[PDB]
Structure formats: C-alpha cells, structure tokens
C-alpha cells in the first residue's frame, strides 16, 4: 500500500497508489482503394445500362 507521485495544485491533486509489484497506409494507397471502389460502381452501372439498352 504505497502512495507515490503526489502532485497538488489549487484545483485538486493526483497520485498513484500501488498494491502489489508485478511478477500506416499512404495517401496514394488510400486513393487507390477509393478509386477502385468507384470504378467497381461505374462498372456495375454500365452493365445495368447495357442490360436496359437490350
């Protein structure tokens, strides 16, 4: 039961009480994935309009 690092100020205080000692993707790669999904949307719409044209 040890209390360490007691810091006091006017608006309060803080401390630590111990009970027992122990025993990214780049901007390019993000734009590639976003443009890939947009192209897959464009392809699905082209297939629809081709189907509707038939």
């Amino acid at each position: 039961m040890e209390v360490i690092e007691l810091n006091k100020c006017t608006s309060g205080q803080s401390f630590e009480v111990i009970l027992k000692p122990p025993s990214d993707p780049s901007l390019e790669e993000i734009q590639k994935k976003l443009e890939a999904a947009e192209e897959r949307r464009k392809y699905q719409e082209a297939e629809l309009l081709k189907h509707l044209a038939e």
């Binding site: 006017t10 027992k20 122990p22 990214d24 999904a37």
Partner: protein, 437 residues
C-alpha cells in the same frame, strides 16, 4: 498549453458533441454568446481551458470543434440551438443525402466526395494551434456516416497528422434504440479499418446507458437526450484533465501511456458513479468508499460485462468533488479485500488517481441531480472483449447467409472486406483471451 480538436461525425457524434460542449460551457462559466467573464486575458491566453476553446478579439470563446454529417437536419440543430453563437459556419459541415446505415456508402461512395472538404476545415483549426495535441472523434458504430466516414477520416488523419494522438468516443449498437439491422456489419467494418489508427477508444454501449437511465433516473422510456446528458457527464470526466489544472492525463499521450500497454487492446472500460435522479428532492450523498465501490458493480459500467472473469492491465480513478486522497486509499484497501480484482502478471497492481475539487456540473432542469462527489473509473479489462464476442456472433449469423451484403457490394465494396474485417476481430478476441487467461 497544447490544443485538442474535437470532431463529431454522424447523428450520434453531433448530438453527443452538442451535449458535451453545453456541459463544457457550464463548467467553465462560458455563456451561450461565447463570452466568459472569468477570463481576464481578452482575445488570447494559454490557460487549461484554451486547449478546447480559442479566443477572438471580441471576447468570444470558440470551441475547437468540427461537426460532420452527410445529412443537414442534425447539424441544423446546432445552427439554431442555444449555443449557436459559439460556432461559426466553417465548423459545421453537412451533406445532401446520408449513408443510409451503410458502411460502404459512408466510406467509399459519399466519403470520397467530402473527405477533402472536412480535412480542409480541420486544417483551419490546426493552423490556429501553437502545439496541436491531437483529435477526439465522436461517432456511432452502427450508422453509415458514423462508421463509414469516420474510418476514412481516421486513415487520412494518420496521414496529415502522423505525430498526433487520436482518441475515440464510440457508441456501441444496442437494439433497444438502434435504427438498423446491419449495425453489426458497420461496427465490425469500422473497427477493422480504424484499429491501427486509434490510440485509445472509449466504447459506450447504448444498452448500458439505457438501463442506467431506467434504473437510476426512473426514466420509463429514455430518449437520446437522456442518453446524451449522461454520456456527456462521462465524457467530461474523461476530458476534464485536459481542460483544468492537474497532473494526471494532462495530454492525449498520457491516455495511451496510462491505459494502453498493448496497442491493439486500447478499449478501456468506463464506470461512473453516482447517477442520482433529480426528481429526488433529498438523496443521501454517497461517500468516497461508496462511489468507489460502485465502480466495480457491472450495473454502472458503460459496457455490461464481468471484470471478475478477466484481468486488469491498468486502472485510473477520476474523482470530481469533495474528495481527499485519505478517503480514496481507505476505500481501495477495503475494496481489495472484498472484490475480485486480478491484474495481469506483467503489470503493477495499482490505481492512478486524479481528483478535481470542482463537483460535477449538471444541466439545469436536467434529470441528473447535483452531487457532492462523483468518480469515473477507467480500467483496461479483458472482460470488455465480451462486447466484441456479442458483436462478432451477430455478424457471423447474418454473413453466413450473406444477408444484406449486396447493399455494400453495390457501393463498390468487395465481399472480401467482410471476411477480412471479421478475421481481424477474431484475432482481436484471441489477443484478449491470451492476456485474460
């Protein structure tokens, strides 16, 4: 003094952000028109409250906040609300049509068309900062914007602000208030792509807030307003150290240092006490021992789970009110002999304690009664994995039949992202089981 920028995404993020900034103004004595009579340095200053509020020459205290939603009706509540005078129009970003509870729609389809606009408005706030700490991101798991656009924003924030910390306040989906059947999908899709980009995330299960509002506030059918008033109290307890003088959790880095030893296990469990109904004309003020003991009752946790069947990696106690260290230690020694509090072998069994003497502020006319002292415990338990296990099970049930999957593929998402996201969650559950047993 180092600044913090708050970002609120989707309906849940915006409405919760609205409730927090109202509470912040009441706590710092900031009037709705932006004026703050206690602030004597007019037009500037590097006080602790300046980490969240900038200052104009006219004396207005402007929140360092950005509101993003793909639908304008929720952010228009801010434009015409009580605190409309705080924000200037550059801080509020709306779209035409929302993401329709579809992660893929919010991340790929609509996110691509608005991500530059959001980042540019965030850049304007960062240019006002002499030393930006990082970002606090408020969002839901289940909404299409809150899940889809957030995970894109978190990726881009890691690109444009690589050295900055990022904290999350996430709303975990609960069917008693949820608005979509596919929310398990969106929750897992957004956890997968945000995991490597969030340093510390606080999950708030709507189920837990709902039952706390029914049980403790005697609200028969709690509304979002009831839920957001309570959530803003917890959020304020967590961010109070950034906005007031102190020594514990004084910058965003300290949250990771004090609560996240293993980076992937960055989901501290929050427990709050006491929650007293304002309709009670006179309630017995709970002692330090009583509110500290309540921190180990599942009924007061932001996520229902059993920390007894799990291990602790860290534990912070944030007291607000009439609290002295003597009463805290007396309460902890008593709790140790009555509670099952198993720490992991490679961490010290202890408690980092912070006390702010100002008692909690409640919204006048709200449902929460003013109390003389309150506490929020932040503990990293492996028991919070129970919430992942629930979420993953509901995912497995629908995905086995590919139910609703066509809505995501129709937005340009590949079916492989589902299984990829699910395998990540399976790895995450395995990490909790290794640490917890």
């Amino acid at each position: 003094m180092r600044e913090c920028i708050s970002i609120h995404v989707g309906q849940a993020g915006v409405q919760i952000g609205n409730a927090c900034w109202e509470l912040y103004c009441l706590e710092h004595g900031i009037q709705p028109d932006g004026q703050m009579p206690s602030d004597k340095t007019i037009g500037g200053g590097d006080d602790s409250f300046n980490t969240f509020f900038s200052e104009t020459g006219a004396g207005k205290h402007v929140p360092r906040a950005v509101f993003v939603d793909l639908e304008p009706t929720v952010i228009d509540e801010v434009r015409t609300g009580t605190y409309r005078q705080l924000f200037h129009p550059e801080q509020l970003i709306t779209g035409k049509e929302d993401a329709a509870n579809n992660y893929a729609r919010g991340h790929y389809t609509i996110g691509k068309e608005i991500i530059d606009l959001v980042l540019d408005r965030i850049r304007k706030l960062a240019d006002q900062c002499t030393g930006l700490q990082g970002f606090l991101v408020f969002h839901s798991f289940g909404g299409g914007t809150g899940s889809g656009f957030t995970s894109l924003l978190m990726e881009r924030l890691s690109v444009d602000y690589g050295k900055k910390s990022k904290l999350e306040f996430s709303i975990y989906p609960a069917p008693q208030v949820s608005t979509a059947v596919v929310e398990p999908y969106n929750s897992i899709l957004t956890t997968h792509t945000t995991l490597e980009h969030s340093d510390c995330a606080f999950m708030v299960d709507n189920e837990a807030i709902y039952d706390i509002c029914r049980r403790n506030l005697d609200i028969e059918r709690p509304t979002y307003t009831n839920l957001n008033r309570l959530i803003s109290q917890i959020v304020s307890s967590i961010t109070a150290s950034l906005r007031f003088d102190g020594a514990l959790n004084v910058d965003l880095t300290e949250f990771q240092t004090n609560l996240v030893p293993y980076p992937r296990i960055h989901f501290p469990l929050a427990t709050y006490a006491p929650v007293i109904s304002a309709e009670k004309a006179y309630h017995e003020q709970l002692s330090v021992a009583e509110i500290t003991n309540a921190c180990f009752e599942p009924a007061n946790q932001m996520v229902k789970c059993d920390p007894r069947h799990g291990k602790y990696m860290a534990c912070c106690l944030l007291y607000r009110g009439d609290v002295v260290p003597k009463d805290v230690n007396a309460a902890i020694a008593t709790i140790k002999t009555k509670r099952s509090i198993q720490f992991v072998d490679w961490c010290p069994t202890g408690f980092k304690v912070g006390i702010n003497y100002q008692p909690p502020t409640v919204v006048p006319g709200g449902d929460l009664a003013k109390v003389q002292r309150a506490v929020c415990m932040l503990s990293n338990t492996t028991a919070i994995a129970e919430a992942w296990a629930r979420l993953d099970h509901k995912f497995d049930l629908m995905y086995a039949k590919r139910a609703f999957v066509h809505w995501y593929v129709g937005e340009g998402m590949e079916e492989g992202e589902f299984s990829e996201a699910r395998e990540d969650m399976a790895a995450l559950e395995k990490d909790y089981e290794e640490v917890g047993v």
